[PDB]
Design a protein around this ligand. Structure first.
Ligand code: MTA
Ligand code: ZN
Length: 269
């Protein structure tokens, strides 16, 4: 139904779906019914969607969530909503959710596009939220859930898992979109740890400059010698926790040991 309900809004309004802003458009109901479920959206929820499009997942959010803020950037799309859909608890904004200043929200539900997967998720970790269901280009979402020491374990992996609990729920065939995307979708859940692990951002970044470096060397190299001499550092080097491991093998737990180790030696705060 939705399959055919797209096509009567397609050339009803007339956008060429550009992959300049990752315009692929979802058309499977058993994929909206799994996110909305996963999020468990009740009527006390201040939601955040991003890149609503022509809003079928936006739709479901209305008929549950308390307040839905949504952010779209194709000023054409922004309007197509208002005519095609009369919503009583919706709130659309102009801009790229990248930079625009965000409302209040406890949950998030959105298909995040390829170009803004990375900076988005980051901003999103510095926020309160009870919960986050988010759709991703598979390559990225695997990246989120990577285990320590795995092929692709990234700063993002650390940072995400440090805050919360990152489960892939369903992979999603590109057969769900017109246009068909180049790669598959996947669905990530984020439940923030009851007690977070609060890493120094700068440190985390210093280490992950070259993430396949041994901790001793990734520190040697991003020791900005912040007012510190040589015989002390190349001592302090030796005893840094996990001076075996390559940076990309570190668990968040262990980034913290290093953190306080360094802290308790005079080196960042
Ligand atoms: C979910 S289908 C893709 C949708 O995401 C929107 N989109 C792409 N990039 C951004 C962005 N930076 N901010 C907000 N919406 C975006 C596109 O305009 C399209 O409607
Ligand atoms: Zn390197």
């Amino acid at each position: 139904k939705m399959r055919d309900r797209l096509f009567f809004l397609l050339s009803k309004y007339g956008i060429r779906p550009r992959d300049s802003i990752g315009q692929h458009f979802l058309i499977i109901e058993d994929v909206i019914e799994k996110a909305i479920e996963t999020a468990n959206v009740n009527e006390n929820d201040v939601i955040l969607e991003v890149g609503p499009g022509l809003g079928f997942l936006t739709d479901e959010l209305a008929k549950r969530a308390k307040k839905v803020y949504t952010i779209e950037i194709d000023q054409k799309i922004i309007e197509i909503l208002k005519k095609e859909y009369s919503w009583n608890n919706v709130k659309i904004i102009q801009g790229a959710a990248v930079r625009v200043e965000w409302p209040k929200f406890n949950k998030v539900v959105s298909n995040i596009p390829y170009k803004i997967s990375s900076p988005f998720t980051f901003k999103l970790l510095k926020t309160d939220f009870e919960r986050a269901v988010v759709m991703y280009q598979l390559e990225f979402a695997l990246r989120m859930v990577a285990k320590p020491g795995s092929r692709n374990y990234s700063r993002l992996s650390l940072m995400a898992q440090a805050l919360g609990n990152v489960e892939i729920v369903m992979k999603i065939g590109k057969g769900a979109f017109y246009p068909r995307p180049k790669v598959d979708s996947a669905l990530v859940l984020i439940e923030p740890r009851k007690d977070k692990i609060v890493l120094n951002e700068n440190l985390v970044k210093a280490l992950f400059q070259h993430r396949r470096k041994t901790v001793p060397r990734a520190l040697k190299d991003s020791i900005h010698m912040l007012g510190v001499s040589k015989d002390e550092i190349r001592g302090i080097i030796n005893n840094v926790p996990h001076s075996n491991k390559r940076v990309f093998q570190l668990y968040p737990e262990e980034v913290k040991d290093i953190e306080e180790y360094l802290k308790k030696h005079g080196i960042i705060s």
